[PDB]
Structure 1
Amino acid sequence: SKKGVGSTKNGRDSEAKRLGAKRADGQFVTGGSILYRQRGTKIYPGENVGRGGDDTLFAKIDGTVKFERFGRDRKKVSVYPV
């Protein structure tokens, strides 16, 4: 016996895009290097960090990276020099 029903309708899925931390806390980091790939602003730019057009957080200068917090319930990437 094999009675026919088909049509899953749910095959497809998009390609995994690699959001999240690309560099860590206390990591030495050159200029222009992507610190955080995200959608929206799960984490904000702080000192010496810029937010991109695809709202990635990248470092503007050389220096270590710190994920501090924006006070209430909110985070922040900031790059400091040595």
Structure 2
Amino acid sequence: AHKKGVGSSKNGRDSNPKYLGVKKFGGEVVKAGNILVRQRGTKFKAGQGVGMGRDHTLFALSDGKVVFINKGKGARFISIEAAQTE
């Protein structure tokens, strides 16, 4: 009443990462960028990454959310010109 060996055979299961909302769309106080949950969002867009430059999301409200390192936590604000006096 056990299990065997020499049959590696070991399928893998599912995930579901994304950039949801990609860069520069109607910004809604909701899941910003994703690739590491428990995540700790940030302020506006993010531009820090194992790449160099940065990314703007011409979309501004409360905040977004990170992914733990990847992408690059937000902080470089960027409400967007669409955040002035009505």
TM-score tier by shorter-chain length is 0.3 to 0.5
| TM-score, structure 2 as length reference | 0.41
- Whose strand proportion is higher, 1 or 2? 1
Structure number with larger C-alpha Rg: 1
| TM-score, structure 1 as length reference | 0.42
